[PDB]
């Protein structure tokens, strides 16, 4: 631990003071499952992203986000955002969590071909309200494909 993060009582030797578990001049690997933290940091990232996206033009908050960029850079792959029409007849963002065993199954394999064929069939045939039903059926079928591909 020399290259990744710097060397202070609060950065590197902090972990060594935390790591005084064994007695044989060695150290285990349960430190990482003990430290757990990203379950909290994700919600913090969602909070700060919500505040930035909804209340821009506040330099007080940009000063804050410039302190937290090392965390937001971690949680950008895992962080979603869509837009729905809420109960209040107003558009609303919806922040939520994305796994890794979904991003590593929607990306590389044949499901891109499935998406391409879906878009082809939709935008040729088409319809009024037999569009989003097709998209949702595609999403359901694709979800079962990804789940079964995880079962290995």
């Amino acid at each position: 631990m020399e290259s990744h993060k710097h060397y202070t009582q609060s950065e590197t030797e902090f972990l060594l003071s935390c790591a005084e578990t064994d007695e044989n001049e060695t150290l285990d690997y349960e430190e990482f499952v003990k430290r757990p933290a990203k379950d909290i940091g994700f919600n913090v990232a969602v909070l700060l992203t919500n505040l930035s996206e909804h209340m821009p033009n506040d330099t007080r908050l940009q000063t804050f986000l410039e302190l937290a960029e090392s965390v937001l850079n971690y949680f950008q792959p895992f962080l979603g955002r869509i837009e729905i029409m809420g109960s209040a007849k107003r558009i609303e963002r919806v922040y939520f969590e994305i796994s890794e065993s979904s991003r590593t199954q929607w990306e590389k394999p044949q499901v891109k071909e499935s998406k391409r064929q879906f878009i082809f069939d939709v935008v040729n045939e088409g319809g009024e309200k037999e569009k989003m039903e097709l998209f949702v059926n595609f999403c359901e079928d694709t979800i079962f494909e990804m789940q079964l591909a995880a079962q290995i």
Binding site: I91, S102, V123
Partner: protein, 425 residues
């Protein structure tokens, strides 16, 4: 160990599927060196060919078997998902077996009854509260027990059978499974005779991709091609009718004169003659016929010949080639249309790349951060795995609509930027 083996075959379906093809190419490359005296083999002084054939014939049947097992493990659950899903939605939102009771047509509907009575009907669909919903929604208007009677290393000792008859009836109607069954059947027949392995060269179509886009040009208008061939047969029938009435004597296809006569005096011989040497001559029918040098019916025969030419050889063959060529053009125009639509419009809203491209890179943010298909898929993937107790207000407002199929929560003609234009808003 069984489950690990089945997961190995399912994970390695396409690789074995491609391996059978190279096996068949090898077999049919060896078959080029066949001979007779009875169908022996004579190599170019190398006796290592018979045993290679004898082992490859076995490998092909084995790999066909493993490909069938891969198809049963991998892709069958998805078609079963689709059937169970459509059945459940027909029950809830349309009321099929309660009110409609479908025709003897729609044989899917007649076959898809004896899954209803069973325990593990929603084995794959992941919606277990189906039967409860139908008991709730029709428990009184039609019946309560009338509904319930309608609905309800030691591995190989207890399992349902009412479900696994419907399941097999589904998969044996599945097209690709039947294709792989034909594959295995021909490889099994490959040992009775080692020429039946030639039929497994037709898997290049399903295997390669661009070859399928070649053959789509023919498949796009196969109906029109077939009816054109029918028109051809009818026209040739009229021409032979005319010939059988009047021009019988020209059709002496014998040798030099003062010889026995081989002639088309009937109708069923003249018709096969015309359809066999009349279109398949490049010039028509006059090429294969005695010449009318000084007959009373000369100009009529000349008209018969050149009209055969200008209606069968030119026109209808041109119709065939034109159907192919228009197929190519149609498919290309389709793909250009999808590019134009997905470059001019958001898939979800239908707004335009003019409200957004006001700002730099607006549309390439709308379709990459805000309104992505994938982030609208992962939301469902989140909601499903989540429990109905941990839902927030937004997730519950959405989950009430998903399981009752409204779709108003998707935007349409509106967006976050249209709502909150930064205008004291």
């Amino acid at each position: 160990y069984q489950q690990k083996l089945l997961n190995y075959f399912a994970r390695n379906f396409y690789n074995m599927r491609m391996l059978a093809l190279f096996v068949a190419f090898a077999i049919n490359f060896i078959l080029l060196f066949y001979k007779v005296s009875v169908h022996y083999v004579l190599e170019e002084s190398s006796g290592y060919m018979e045993p290679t054939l004898r082992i490859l014939a076995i490998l092909h049947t084995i790999i066909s078997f493993f490909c069938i097992i891969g198809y049963y493990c991998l892709k069958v659950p998805l078609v079963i998902f689709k059937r169970e899903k459509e059945v459940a939605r027909k029950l809830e939102f349309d009321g099929l077996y309660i009110t409609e009771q479908p025709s003897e047509d729609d044989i899917k509907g007649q076959w898809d009854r004896l899954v209803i009575n069973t325990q593990s009907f929603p084995n794959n669909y992941w919606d277990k509260f189906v039967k409860r919903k139908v008991m709730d929604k029709y428990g009184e208007f039609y019946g309560r027990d009338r509904i319930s009677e309608l609905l309800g290393s030691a591995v190989l000792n207890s399992i349902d059978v009412k479900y696994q008859m419907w399941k097999l009836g589904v998969v044996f109607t599945d097209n690709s499974f039947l294709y792989l069954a034909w594959y295995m059947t021909m490889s099994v027949l490959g040992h009775y005779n080692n020429f039946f392995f030639a039929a497994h060269l037709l898997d290049i179509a399903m295997g390669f991709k661009t070859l399928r886009t070649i053959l789509s040009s023919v498949t796009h208008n196969g109906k029109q091609l077939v009816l054109t061939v029918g028109l051809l047969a009818v026209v040739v029938y009229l021409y032979t009718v005319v010939a059988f009435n009047f021009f019988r004597k020209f059709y002496n296809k014998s040798e030099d004169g003062d010889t026995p006569d081989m002639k088309c005096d009937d109708m069923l011989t003249c018709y096969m003659f015309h359809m066999y040497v009349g279109v398949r001559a490049g010039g028509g029918i006059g090429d294969e016929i005695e010449d009318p040098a000084g007959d009373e019916y000369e100009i009529y025969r000349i008209i018969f010949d050149i009209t055969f030419f200008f209606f069968v050889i030119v026109i209808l063959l041109a119709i065939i080639q034109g159907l192919i060529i228009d197929a190519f053009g149609e498919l290309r125009d389709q793909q250009e249309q999808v590019k134009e639509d997905m470059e001019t419009k958001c898939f979800i809203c239908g707004i335009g790349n003019d409200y957004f491209d006001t700002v730099p890179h607006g549309f390439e943010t709308h379709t990459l951060q805000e309104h992505n298909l994938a982030n609208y898929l992962f939301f469902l993937m989140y909601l499903i795995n989540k429990d109905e107790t941990e839902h927030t207000g937004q997730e519950s407002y959405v989950w009430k609509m998903y399981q009752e199929r409204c779709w108003e929560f998707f935007p349409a003609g509106d967006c976050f930027r249209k709502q909150y234009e930064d205008q004291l808003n």
